[PDB]
Nucleic acid binder design. Structure first.
Length: 49
DNA sequence: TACAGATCGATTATGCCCCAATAACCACACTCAACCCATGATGTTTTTTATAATGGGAGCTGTCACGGATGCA
């Protein structure tokens, strides 16, 4: 997978609602990784590694 | 005149003293280990060092996706 920024989605992970949870992803060539995530309550969350 | 026997003289038997090997039984012996006791060379362990030194992450891990509990807040 090439270094850069990629965006993804979820297809039925949250069975309670069935919403689509988009997320962003930063993967450098070397170094720590950065992720941006949504929630069913529509809130932004981050994750490192 | 025809027909008999009769003793010299030879192969066969049977046994054993020796004896030229036969075997067990007893006598004395050197050489080669085996273990030990040192001498010493090699090995192994302990001790100390006084300018000053005062908080790593070591390479993460790279990302699957079910279910069943589960411990909370």
């Amino acid at each position: 997978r090439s270094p850069g920024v990629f965006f993804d989605s979820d297809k039925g992970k949250t069975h309670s609602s069935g919403k689509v949870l988009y997320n962003a992803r930063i993967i450098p060539y070397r170094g720590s990784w950065l992720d941006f995530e949504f929630d069913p309550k529509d809130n932004l969350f981050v994750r490192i590694d």
